[PDB]
Amino acid sequence: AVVLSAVFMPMAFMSGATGEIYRQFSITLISSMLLSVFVAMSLTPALCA
Amino acid sequence: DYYLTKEKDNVQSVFTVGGFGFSGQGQNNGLAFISLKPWSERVGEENSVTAIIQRAMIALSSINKAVVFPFNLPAVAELGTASGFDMELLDNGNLGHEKLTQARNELLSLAAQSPNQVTGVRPNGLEDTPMFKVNVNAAKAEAMGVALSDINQTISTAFGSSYVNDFLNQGRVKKVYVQAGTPFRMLPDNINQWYVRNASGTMAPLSAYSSTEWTYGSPRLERYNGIPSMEILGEAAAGKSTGDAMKFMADLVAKLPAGVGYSWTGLSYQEALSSNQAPALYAISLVVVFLALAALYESWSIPFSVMLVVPLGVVGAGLSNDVYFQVGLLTTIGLSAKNAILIVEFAVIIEAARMRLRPILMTSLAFILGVLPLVISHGAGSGAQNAVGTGVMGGMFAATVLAIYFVPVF
Amino acid sequence: SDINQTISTAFGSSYVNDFLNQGRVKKVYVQAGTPFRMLPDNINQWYVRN
Amino acid sequence: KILLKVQQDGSQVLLRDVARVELGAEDYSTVARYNGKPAAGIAIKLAAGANALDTSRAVKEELNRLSAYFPASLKTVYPYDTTPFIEISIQEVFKTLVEAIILVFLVMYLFLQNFRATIIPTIAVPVVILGTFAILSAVGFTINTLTMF
Amino acid sequence: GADAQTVEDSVTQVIEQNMNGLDGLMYMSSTSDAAGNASITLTFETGTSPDIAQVQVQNKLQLAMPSLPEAVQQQGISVDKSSSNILMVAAFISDNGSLNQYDIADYVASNIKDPLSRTAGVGSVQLFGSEYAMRIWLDPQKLNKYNL
Amino acid sequence: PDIAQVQVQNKLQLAMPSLPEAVQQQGISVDKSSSNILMVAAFISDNGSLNQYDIADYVASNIKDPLSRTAGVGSVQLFGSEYAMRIWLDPQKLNKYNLVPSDVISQIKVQNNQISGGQLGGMPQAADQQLNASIIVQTRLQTPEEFGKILLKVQQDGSQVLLRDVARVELGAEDYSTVARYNGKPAAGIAIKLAAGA
Numbered sequence A: 001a002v003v004l005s006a007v008f009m010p011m012a013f014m015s016g017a018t019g020e021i022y023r024q025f026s027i028t029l030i031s032s033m034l035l036s037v038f039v040a041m042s043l044t045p046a047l048c049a
Numbered sequence B: 001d002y003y004l005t006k007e008k009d010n011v012q013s014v015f016t017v018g019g020f021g022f023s024g025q026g027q028n029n030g031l032a033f034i035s036l037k038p039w040s041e042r043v044g045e046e047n048s049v050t051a052i053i054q055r056a057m058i059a060l061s062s063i064n065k066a067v068v069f070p071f072n073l074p075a076v077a078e079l080g081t082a083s084g085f086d087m088e089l090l091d092n093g094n095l096g097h098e099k100l101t102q103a104r105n106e107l108l109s110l111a112a113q114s115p116n117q118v119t120g121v122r123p124n125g126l127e128d129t130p131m132f133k134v135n136v137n138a139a140k141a142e143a144m145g146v147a148l149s150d151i152n153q154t155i156s157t158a159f160g161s162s163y164v165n166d167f168l169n170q171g172r173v174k175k176v177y178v179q180a181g182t183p184f185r186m187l188p189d190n191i192n193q194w195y196v197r198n199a200s201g202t203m204a205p206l207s208a209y210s211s212t213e214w215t216y217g218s219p220r221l222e223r224y225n226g227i228p229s230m231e232i233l234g235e236a237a238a239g240k241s242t243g244d245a246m247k248f249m250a251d252l253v254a255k256l257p258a259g260v261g262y263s264w265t266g267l268s269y270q271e272a273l274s275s276n277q278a279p280a281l282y283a284i285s286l287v288v289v290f291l292a293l294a295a296l297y298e299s300w301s302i303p304f305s306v307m308l309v310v311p312l313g314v315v316g317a318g319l320s321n322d323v324y325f326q327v328g329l330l331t332t333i334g335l336s337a338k339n340a341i342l343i344v345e346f347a348v349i350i351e352a353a354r355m356r357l358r359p360i361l362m363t364s365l366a367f368i369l370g371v372l373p374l375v376i377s378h379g380a381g382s383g384a385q386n387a388v389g390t391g392v393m394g395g396m397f398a399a400t401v402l403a404i405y406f407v408p409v410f
Numbered sequence C: 001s002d003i004n005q006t007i008s009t010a011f012g013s014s015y016v017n018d019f020l021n022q023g024r025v026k027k028v029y030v031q032a033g034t035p036f037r038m039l040p041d042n043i044n045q046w047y048v049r050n
Numbered sequence D: 001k002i003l004l005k006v007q008q009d010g011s012q013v014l015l016r017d018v019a020r021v022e023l024g025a026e027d028y029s030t031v032a033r034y035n036g037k038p039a040a041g042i043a044i045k046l047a048a049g050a051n052a053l054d055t056s057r058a059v060k061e062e063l064n065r066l067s068a069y070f071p072a073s074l075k076t077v078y079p080y081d082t083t084p085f086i087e088i089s090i091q092e093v094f095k096t097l098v099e100a101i102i103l104v105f106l107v108m109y110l111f112l113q114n115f116r117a118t119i120i121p122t123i124a125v126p127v128v129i130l131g132t133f134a135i136l137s138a139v140g141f142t143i144n145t146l147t148m149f
Numbered sequence E: 001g002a003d004a005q006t007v008e009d010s011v012t013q014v015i016e017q018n019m020n021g022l023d024g025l026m027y028m029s030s031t032s033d034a035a036g037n038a039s040i041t042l043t044f045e046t047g048t049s050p051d052i053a054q055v056q057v058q059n060k061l062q063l064a065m066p067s068l069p070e071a072v073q074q075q076g077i078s079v080d081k082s083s084s085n086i087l088m089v090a091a092f093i094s095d096n097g098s099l100n101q102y103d104i105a106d107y108v109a110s111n112i113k114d115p116l117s118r119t120a121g122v123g124s125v126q127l128f129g130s131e132y133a134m135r136i137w138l139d140p141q142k143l144n145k146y147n148l
Numbered sequence F: 001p002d003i004a005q006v007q008v009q010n011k012l013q014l015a016m017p018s019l020p021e022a023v024q025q026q027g028i029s030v031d032k033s034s035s036n037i038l039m040v041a042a043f044i045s046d047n048g049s050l051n052q053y054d055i056a057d058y059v060a061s062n063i064k065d066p067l068s069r070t071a072g073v074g075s076v077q078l079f080g081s082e083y084a085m086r087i088w089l090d091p092q093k094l095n096k097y098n099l100v101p102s103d104v105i106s107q108i109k110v111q112n113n114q115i116s117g118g119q120l121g122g123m124p125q126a127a128d129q130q131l132n133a134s135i136i137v138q139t140r141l142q143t144p145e146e147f148g149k150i151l152l153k154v155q156q157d158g159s160q161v162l163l164r165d166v167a168r169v170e171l172g173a174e175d176y177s178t179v180a181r182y183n184g185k186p187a188a189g190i191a192i193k194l195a196a197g198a
Ligand SMILES: CCCCCCCCCCCCO[C@@H]1O[C@H](CO)[C@@H](O[C@H]2O[C@H](CO)[C@@H](O)[C@H](O)[C@H]2O)[C@H](O)[C@H]1O
Pocket: A013, A014, A015, A016, A019, B280, B281, B284
């Protein structure tokens, strides 16, 4: 998740309509692994306990 | 009457407005909104929108003195009512309306000569119509003491409904219009009934010094970036993309007489603006994804040196693919990389892949059944998704079994 | 008013309206000729209607 | 009764003597009908950035409120309404999300055969997906086909 | 009461020649029909503020306002951030047929148009009708009779 | 800058009705123009077939407004003028026919005018007519000889007094105040001002 966030980090600092289209992938992805790394270490341990 | 008499069992309301249309406002334009009963009463596919539209086409093709074209609202009503290419024929050479019309007809003839490339090419504007021209002998009117301004104002007021001022009606301000009566402005002979006052105060009819003739004129004029133009529509031929036919039409225009340009608008402009910059963004995205597949397994370590061979496969790879699939291929490469990852990092494979073969098919099926809601209502639209899906799942299972083991020795 | 308008039109290029030239709208100007507005003596050449 | 001219004998020439004055339409170029009956219509265009469902509810409520002052023979009908389609689309997307999570649970249960062991991912995934929805809403990212990939 | 050529060369070109210097302008297309309507559509780059674009367009239009014919000025020129999509259509009918289309349209435009138009979330409204107007139908024979 | 320009243009609209008519007709421009000049483009003639007036008119008619609407361009300034249907009056000839520049201006306004001719069978129409066609009355004059044939006055003997009899009508520059040259040859130029933030 850290590596994916890093590689997708500098995509959101360039403009353009195609860039704005690619934001609809990039921002959702960085949010995706950020939520994933939150939930895997936070929520699932509580359940399995 | 046709909608509310022959198919009363599926239509709810018919709202027809005359004098309006998407081509503009005019006496010969017609438009109709149709409302259908709710899905509870519309059962089966025979009462669906498509079947009723097809029946409407078949029944209304019999309208002899009009062109009735029932159609469904498109998926994106903000971009037009159909697909294909949108083209503007620019007269940047200052040639004139007639020369541009001749050029447009020549382009249509040339396009019709090669149906294997472009299909259904047609103009969008309206054709020329007969128009009435009144010629006023200014010298003759001036000889008998009648001002030309009076004649022009008389004609314009009589046939044009000149607006005067406002008045109050039930507490609201509303306009006041002055025009000739209905039975006085319907025929060309009606002009001879009009009179105008001279300087002496007497009256002389308009027929004394005015001559009328029939000419032709354009009922609708189109401009693009301040340059006169006429729109041209059409769709690419079957089995062909948009770019090839678009370039072919560009060459066709290059064959037109000098002074005539061209330009793309609407969807075609968007795709052209995407295409001329697509290679650079695709190259930088490929560099970024290469860094992604070069940073995780520490440099050319084990698999990332075989992913170094991936660019050769990419360069090896007229058939095309849409914008969504261009990112879908990258996501497929990424998910294959991840299918390798949680075993390759463990190696960084026997036990790891024994306990991680299951996640391969969970992720594959999760992606498949997550893109499934985009297309499916259950039952319908499922037979055509088992061709690519099953083959890709089998290929991914084989890749998990073999490649993460051959690549280490490779 | 006639005298002032005459002088202003003769020496000031009063603008009238627009006209079409090669598909473009362009202005129309009215002014005195070049050899009639170069010297102070040029005013005595002008006439106005009573 | 507007005076235009007085003749030499003192007679008056009113507007009605030379023209027929009547209360008529401002623009006659448009003719509308409903099921063959005379009618008039309003085309409502959605403002940029405004959600369709709430705007339509507001418009319908405004029409209902104004209906109290209508003439004795005037009624309101909707010949072209798109909002029931939007409502049924969202009602279908909720169903499709719930059946997606149900099928994920079913696959995981087919794997482990232990409902207590199988449930953990079942509640794990939808929290992530709805959190992602929340972030894309907060930033201002629309629910568009690109997102639904 | 204007033809296509007249409305074009009297309104459309005049407005277009002063439609430069706009930020994010993508392209501009215009039409001029024989009904007397001059419609100019301006497309801006994606992401441009619609309010800013509308303000700029309305300001630049004020330059060409004195150059337009008097009738066009009196009719009024509207600039709106209108999208092509239609949200919903509301129709009004008469039960007993006591009111023709003119009465219904006039009542609608006088009472229901402007509160609905100012309701939140509504971009623009279009009326399929017309208000009342004190139409005066001239008679050429009677006018000639009284020297008018 | 956009907010400031909008505020200035709005506040200017207050004083618009108070300004003289000629100033209103000329038009008032409000622009977010910086003093710096990005680049200057010049246009010349190889064989000298075109004088500075033709070159400037062609430039202002064809190259100005597409360049002005090009992205990143704040404002452009033309070192020249478009064409304008200049009418050079002759005081002696005007006095000869008992004419005043005011009547010449009025006659030009009348005869060089577009008139909305309406249309036959427009709304509302009868219930049994099939013909609907526009009516063309008068169009704006185009050629210089068209202007030269404008009627001004008819003498008592029936002779006509045209515009060409009292004035020399020719296609000339709209503004003669600017003269530009390139290496001594006639030319016209455009000053391109960089837009703010581009
Ligand atoms: C010898 C003949 C040479 C002819 C070459 C013709 C074209 C060949 C490919 C060149 C492409 C380089 O084009 C380059 O693209 C990047 C984006 O990827 C652009 O970069 C731009 O977009 C990014 C965001 O995406 C921004 O962060 C950046 O600030 C912006 O300037 C540059 O404006 C441009 O310099």
